[PDB]
Design a protein around this ligand. Structure first.
Ligand SMILES: [Zn+2]
Length: 258
């Protein structure tokens, strides 16, 4: 009986195996835009993805992860709220069964159709596994998706999904450029939080961009053809793989912009 997103194993049950689910800095949260104070001390955010090297894409039974070779100093996030440098290891999405839901963070309670998470580890800790033992081990860049015009840079992801339909399937996925997934503006909100799937560890400086990207209805429909089940098991469509907003517990959300 493993964790998932269903009635008997979903977010409301996670705390039994992962008591930190009720911790002091859980994610996602609702971003109340009126009360996220502008912080002029935030230096500009630096997203440097030139020469990033993707390796593989994996259906892990919850979402799909595009994994990067993080053995060298390339694909880094720095500046903004961050001290030091954080190295990209993977990205993935959360999405809905319907366009009206799917994101994890919300903006004045608004849910977007999906949300992209680019996961990075603080290089001072040597690798991801040691970084997740630290309260400043991770930085996740979150990007909202709305349904409208297609995002051309997403298409190469969409087109490999048929080859990883079910849990445990993976495929070679080299030379994918995540710069094609980024909106124009780097204006953001930031706050201290956690991973949003088990083990829910409280390592993350969250950086959530204000500007969504647009993807087409057809692109998100192909996300919704993935399966949570493994091959040869009854088909359960991979949809609504988002955790709802969690209590803020007096954390402050800061805005990079006026
Ligand atoms: Zn995520």
């Amino acid at each position: 009986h493993h964790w998932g997103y269903g009635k008997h194993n979903g977010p409301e049950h996670w705390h039994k195996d992962f008591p930190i689910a009720k911790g002091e800095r859980q994610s996602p949260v609702d971003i109340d835009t009126h009360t996220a104070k502008y912080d002029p001390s935030l230096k500009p955010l630096s997203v440097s993805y030139d020469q990033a090297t993707s390796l593989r894409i994996l259906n892990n039974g919850h979402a799909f992860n595009v994994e990067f070779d993080d053995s060298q100093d390339k694909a880094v996030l720095k500046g903004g709220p961050l001290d030091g440098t954080y190295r990209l290891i993977q990205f993935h999405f959360h999405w809905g069964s319907l366009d009206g839901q799917g994101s994890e963070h919300t903006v004045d309670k608004k849910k977007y159709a999906a949300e992209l998470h680019l996961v990075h580890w603080n290089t001072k800790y040597g690798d991801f596994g040691k970084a997740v033992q630290q309260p400043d081990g991770l930085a996740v860049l979150g990007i909202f998706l709305k349904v409208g015009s297609a995002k051309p840079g997403l298409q190469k992801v969409v087109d490999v999904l048929d080859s990883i339909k079910t849990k445990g399937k993976s495929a070679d996925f080299t030379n994918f450029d995540p710069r094609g997934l980024l909106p124009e503006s780097l204006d953001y909100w930031t706050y201290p939080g956690s991973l949003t799937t088990p083990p829910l560890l409280e390592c993350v400086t969250w950086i959530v961009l204000k500007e969504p990207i647009s993807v087409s209805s057809e692109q998100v429909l192909k996300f919704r053809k993935l399966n949570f089940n493994g091959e040869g098991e009854p088909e359960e469509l991979m949809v609504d793989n988002w955790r709802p907003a969690q209590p803020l517990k007096n954390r402050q959300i800061k805005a990079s912009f006026k």
